[PDB]
Amino acid sequence: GFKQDIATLRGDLRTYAQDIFLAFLNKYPDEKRNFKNYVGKSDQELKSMAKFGDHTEKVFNLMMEVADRATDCVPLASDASTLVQMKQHSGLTTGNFEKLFVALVEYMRASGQSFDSQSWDRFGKNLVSALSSAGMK
Ligand SMILES: Oc1c(Cl)cc(Cl)cc1Cl
Numbered sequence: 001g002f003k004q005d006i007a008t009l010r011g012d013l014r015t016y017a018q019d020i021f022l023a024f025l026n027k028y029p030d031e032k033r034n035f036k037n038y039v040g041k042s043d044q045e046l047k048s049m050a051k052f053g054d055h056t057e058k059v060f061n062l063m064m065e066v067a068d069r070a071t072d073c074v075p076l077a078s079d080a081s082t083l084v085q086m087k088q089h090s091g092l093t094t095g096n097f098e099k100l101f102v103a104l105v106e107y108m109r110a111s112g113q114s115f116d117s118q119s120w121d122r123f124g125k126n127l128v129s130a131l132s133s134a135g136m137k
Pocket of ligand 1: 051052055059
């Protein structure tokens with residue numbers, strides 16, 4: 001289930017973080033509008049850029065903590081209030097996070113592993129709602 005998936009993702013987190021984030025940027029090319037430094041790069045080039053690997057892993061490091069602290073895929077309100085009070089996220093809509101989770105769920109559905117993709121879809125929805133309730137546009 002969801003909890004085991006957290007463990008699975010953590011056991012190879014740098015790879016999963018990069019592959020899922022690339023799936024997001026490739027499915028939603030306009031999202032590079034928030035990632036000016038990644039334009040005109042293939043997946044293999046992005047994987048060569050220090051901040052790409054370091055930032056994607058940090059994002060997923062914190063996403064897994066928020067998943068771990070959730071109950072029945074519902075994150076703590078403190079964790080959402082922390083995501084909202086992020087200066088790096090000042091120019092972000094809930095829609096950006098929604099798209100990242102659509103890509104994450106589709107990645108899990110396409111893998112041969114028994115990820116609980118429906119739980120991740122609920123988690124992404126519930127995190128968006130919690131971000132909106134904590135003040136994200
Ligand atoms: O470089 C970044 C990456 Cl790869 C992902 C996110 Cl969500 C934010 C930043 Cl600044």
